[PDB]
Scaffold this motif. Structure first.
Motif, PDB file in Angstrom:
ATOM      1  N   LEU A 129       0.845  -1.176   0.000  1.00  0.00           N
ATOM      2  CA  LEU A 129       0.000   0.000   0.000  1.00  0.00           C
ATOM      3  C   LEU A 129       0.886   1.232   0.000  1.00  0.00           C
ATOM      4  N   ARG A 146       4.188   0.431   2.392  1.00  0.00           N
ATOM      5  CA  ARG A 146       3.811  -0.287   3.595  1.00  0.00           C
ATOM      6  C   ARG A 146       3.096  -1.596   3.235  1.00  0.00           C
ATOM      7  N   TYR A 276      -9.105   5.655   5.267  1.00  0.00           N
ATOM      8  CA  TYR A 276      -9.624   4.712   6.255  1.00  0.00           C
ATOM      9  C   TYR A 276      -9.744   5.368   7.631  1.00  0.00           C
ATOM     10  N   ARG A 283      -3.282   0.528  10.987  1.00  0.00           N
ATOM     11  CA  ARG A 283      -3.933   1.024   9.769  1.00  0.00           C
ATOM     12  C   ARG A 283      -4.213   2.532   9.730  1.00  0.00           C
ATOM     13  N   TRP A 285      -2.524   5.028   9.081  1.00  0.00           N
ATOM     14  CA  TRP A 285      -1.839   5.673   7.964  1.00  0.00           C
ATOM     15  C   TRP A 285      -2.467   5.378   6.594  1.00  0.00           C
ATOM     16  N   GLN A 286      -3.426   4.439   6.469  1.00  0.00           N
ATOM     17  CA  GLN A 286      -3.803   4.010   5.116  1.00  0.00           C
ATOM     18  C   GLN A 286      -4.803   4.965   4.473  1.00  0.00           C
ATOM     19  N   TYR A 288      -5.193   5.809   0.107  1.00  0.00           N
ATOM     20  CA  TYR A 288      -4.657   5.674  -1.228  1.00  0.00           C
ATOM     21  C   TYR A 288      -5.226   6.799  -2.075  1.00  0.00           C
TER      22      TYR A 288
END
Ligand SMILES: [Cu+2]
Ligand SMILES: [Cu+2]
Ligand code: NA
Ligand code: NA
Lengths: 621, 621
Positions: A129, A146, A276, A283, A285-286, A288
């Motif tokens: 990711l 990541r 997210y 998670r 940091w996620q 996209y």
């Protein structure tokens, strides 16, 4: 030959040869983006100048280049070396995706974390990711991905059903190095499978569905000339394809009588973002940016007849570049068909005795992309009555996690032990407007409540107000569904027969915008997503709402930088950016493969025509 | 035979004979409403008792009666005489509509107003509109219709193009008497015609449209048994027809495995209202309740094959009563077909190599009604994935006026001298909920923004909250698009396999509600239309949100009276009322016949199922 024609396999080969010769396309080089640039304003008469923009990555660690080439003349036009700690990284390469699982397989901290969980390393898939920008100082200037782990039980198994929570890794895929492995705790890996083709999970398939047969015995009503120029039911446009944006629509115009009137100069989905909402350090940091970081057109599916597209289908097969400048065809990547769309207009008049019914139709231009677990369809619709609509279809498999036994406020439960964190899917449409030419303006239209009293004695009156947006600093707007708020794009120099400006009205769906705290990293990088509507003065280099290099860039780039120039947009060459998206709280019905959910926007004529533009549609055969 | 079967021509004849015999169906009597009543709660086992409700008007001036009859036994059950100054008038009769133009033709004040304008009385059509309740004291207890004039130039001419402004009349159509003629001034009658079948206005018709052929070589996938009971792709329901509400849906249920699970007990559009926003005294009284005042099912069109309904069509031909108790068939009044609906679910998985696509379908139940210049389509949609959607399609010819030379804030200009006042079209859906049985509750769900800080260190978290509505006095709710607000109807006593209550989520379009000043007459009579969502405890006599007798009734009846009982609705037998509508600012493209505009709502499963309910759908043929 039209200057908006699709890029050819021949042209791709020329760009590779032009770069090789010039020494810029070495053997350590990789093309991370290649696309044809749009003609400049006003240079239609005359002369080709097919130019191409190229982002060249360097596997050894050197600095990447931005390069423009003319293939009609045959030279490099400019070449620029980039400081990526400054302006952001280049887009993720396809071949970097697997380096993450292959590297992690030999790292001792990662082997250690899998052994504590009794997992065979050969059964662990790693989802690579994008990294974003957070507190880690050693990542600025580095190409970082990541990695989150899922277990496959057998090669045909859906890994998404078995997340390995409490574990994440970060990887530098230039120097091949695992910077950190973070193990916050062991979670049970959920045991049920999610194999939606397994007869044990699907049960017996239905035998009750009988076929629907859609055919055009005389062929379709639209024509395609020049590879990609479309004529349909008074509509005229060019269908472009870019590896970053996907399907792009050029020169949308409507033949009113014997004038070809322009409506939109360029329409695209110029960015999207998937944030997210789970505060877990595994998670949190996620996010996209599928378009800016991964390039959605690179992952376009090939669409099958009778399965993905039904009816009388005409395909386009766009050509892109692989990472070495070899042309690659996406066979059957764009579908185009017309579709019946019910009743257009109907009235039975008692006094005249005339019964009148006409049916509507739409023409559909679509493509579908797959990035990891997500599948996104992009649909453009043109209707007989002059309406333009965009619709995004989101399907695929939800991104999963463990469900914590205490429960969670930010994750929902799909199955025993299995969670799906909350998230959004947010799109940015960039509409380079050309309502009857390039002198355009935007008004915001609100319904107006009136109080009972003098002039309004029975308290039944209501009205509307329009507010002109005159400078860019005024042109950051938000929705207000309660006041019926819409935006009108008009040409003050082109009037209909009632002597009012011609216009198109933008109808938004008024879904929530970006939910993250305004001080977050994602609110800085996805500033565009915090407001529904932005208007800018056109400029050739202002193409994406997040800037040219999204991967690992700090915030600020794109729209909040453009609008700071505070340019005149009252009757000028303008660009409308509309943010819209889905707020996804996963439900049990989304598991183990999710039904399509949709979001979009539309534009309808608002005194553009002098009367209904569909009086000449015939009684049905 | 099912107790939800459509009323038969035989049953209508019995009700007429039962009333004649009893002396209630004299020769001065007129049936103004006849419909079969729904079975009472719990009496399914057993015994027929086909009962019918009848409103009997009296042309001589006597008081009307409400009457119930049992036709399976053959007697009157009750007969009640009505004080119409108290409880409101009976619905407008078809034959009263023309009395207005015929009476006005011999009135001297009306002849005087037409002569000042040089109009031949034989060319003046009068639109008969419901009266409402305003300041005129002599109208309480009277049956009153108001009349607005349009000029027809020749028998095939569209009168709507030539309004006669500044003129209105009021008529008593029992005593045949023109109470008032109000002439506020002469306006030019607009001269252009609006004849959308005239080759001079349409120009040459298109020859570019090629046919779309939709066929089912093996027939449709749904079955109809018992006249009106539908089985389709695990769905089960009964299609009813009432002369007031139109298509009514009964016993909507989904076959999950081998349980038939209920979802909705009764679904209907139980009222609609069309308020006009022009403060001119000529029109500031105009509001229609199409459903409550005119009865929309009485004016259902007969739908033509290939023109109104396309594909493999199955029709129902509902029977109603004329004003003397004679059965009347509406041939081909309800259309039913299934429709391809694109992609249901799609994912290409890199790690397993499986490519999976399934197509969606919907079944469509529709009818179309015409009242004066307006045409309304009513569409119910059932999807494979368990979604239920309603869509209203509004078309026809706009209601017109003069355009004042100064311009107007409450009227728009369609053509030289021709205006179209602002208005709304507002619907009330009544959903008698039965989510897995009759123990249901409603929660309001808002997205929740979280602040950056401890527990949410990167400021990325967001959540949702649900608020249970426990008493009726709490259950008057408004929309909030900015917080993503939805309503969940659940059964707290029926859990899915994760042990959460099963539920359905209501997604509204969040259009503006009633705009009129809250002190207006229309805000009192259309109280329901001022809020998006109401929840009541079920009761057999609480059927319409405006009460049983809408015509000329004062405000207050219906929903604001029901909810004052402040009953328990937390896990009880409940009814959801959803207000939704269109705010129509007419545009030039709406003239001279208008393209369809749409509004609606949908309900999607929210943990009703244990996993996707469409895993057993097959790969396409
Ligand atoms: Cu999602
Ligand atoms: Cu309207
Ligand atoms: Na522009
Ligand atoms: Na109920």
């Amino acid at each position: 030959a039209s200057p908006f024609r699709l890029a050819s396999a021949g042209e791709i080969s020329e760009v590779q040869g032009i770069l090789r010769t010039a020494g810029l396309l070495g053997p350590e080089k990789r093309i991370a983006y290649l696309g044809v640039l749009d003609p400049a304003r006003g240079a239609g008469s005359e002369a080709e100048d097919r130019r191409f923009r190229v982002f060249i990555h360097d596997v050894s660690g050197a600095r990447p280049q931005e390069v423009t080439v003319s293939v009609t003349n045959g030279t490099v036009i400019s070449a620029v070396e980039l400081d990526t700690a400054a302006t952001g990284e280049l887009p993720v390469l396809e071949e970097e995706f697997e380096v993450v699982e292959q590297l992690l397989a030999t790292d001792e901290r990662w082997l250690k974390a899998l052994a504590a969980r009794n997992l065979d390393v050969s059964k662990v898939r790693v989802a690579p990711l994008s990294a974003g920008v957070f507190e880690y100082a050693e990542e600025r200037g580095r190409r970082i991905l990541r990695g989150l782990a899922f277990v496959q039980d057998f090669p045909e198994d859906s890994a998404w059903a078995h997340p390995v929570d409490g574990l994440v890794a970060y990887v530098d895929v230039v120097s091949k190095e695992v910077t950190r492995v973070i193990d916050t705790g062991v979670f049970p890996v959920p045991a049920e499978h999610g194999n939606y083709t397994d007869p044990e999970l699907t049960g017996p398939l239905r035998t009750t569905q009988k076929p629907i047969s859609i055919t055009q015995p005389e062929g379709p009503s639209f024509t395609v000339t020049g590879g990609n120029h479309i004529e349909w039911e008074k509509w005229s446009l060019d269908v472009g394809f870019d590896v970053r944006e996907g399907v792009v629509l050029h020169n949308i115009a409507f033949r009113d009588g014997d004038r070809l009137r322009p409506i939109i100069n360029r329409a695209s989905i110029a960015e999207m973002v998937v944030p997210y909402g789970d505060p877990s350090p595994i998670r949190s940091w996620q996010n996209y940016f599928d378009t800016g970081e991964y390039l959605v057109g690179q992952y376009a599916n090939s669409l099958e007849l009778g399965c993905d597209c039904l009816g009388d289908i005409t395909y386009l097969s766009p050509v892109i570049s692989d990472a070495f400048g070899n042309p690659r065809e996406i066979r059957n990547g764009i579908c185009m068909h017309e579709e019946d769309w019910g009743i257009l207009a109907k009235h039975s008049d008692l006094w005249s005795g005339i019964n009148y019914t006409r049916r509507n139709r739409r023409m559909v231009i679509s493509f579908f992309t797959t990035i990891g677990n997500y599948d996104y369809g992009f649909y453009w619709y043109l209707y007989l009555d002059g309406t333009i609509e965009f619709e995004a279809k989101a399907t695929g498999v939800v991104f999963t996690s463990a469900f914590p036994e205490g429960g969670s406020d930010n994750i929902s439960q799909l199955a025993p032990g299995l969670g799906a964190p909350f998230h959004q899917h947010i799109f940015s449409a960039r509409l380079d407007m050309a309502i009857d030419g390039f002198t355009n303006r935007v008004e915001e239209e609100d319904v107006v409540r009136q109080t009972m009293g003098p002039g309004n004695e029975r308290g039944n009156a209501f009205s509307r107000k329009r507010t002109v947006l005159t400078r860019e600093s005024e042109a950051v707007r938000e929705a207000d569904a309660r006041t019926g708020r819409t935006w009108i794009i008009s040409n003050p120099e082109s009037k209909n027969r009632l002597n009012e400006p011609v216009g198109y009205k933008l109808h938004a769906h008024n879904q929530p915008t970006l939910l993250a705290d305004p001080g977050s990293s994602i609110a800085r990088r996805a500033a565009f997503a915090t407001k529904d509507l932005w208007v800018t003065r056109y400029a050739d280099d202002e193409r994406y709402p997040t800037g040219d290099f999204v991967n690992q860039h700090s915030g600020g780039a794109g729209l909040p930088s453009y609008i700071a120039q505070d340019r005149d947009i009252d009757g000028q060459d303008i660009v409308v950016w509309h943010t819209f998206g889905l707020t996804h709280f996963p439900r049990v019905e989304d598991w183990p493969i999710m039904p399509v959910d949709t979001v979009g926007f539309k534009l309808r004529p608002e005194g553009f025509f002098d009367r209904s533009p569909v009086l000449d549609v015939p009684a049905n055969p």
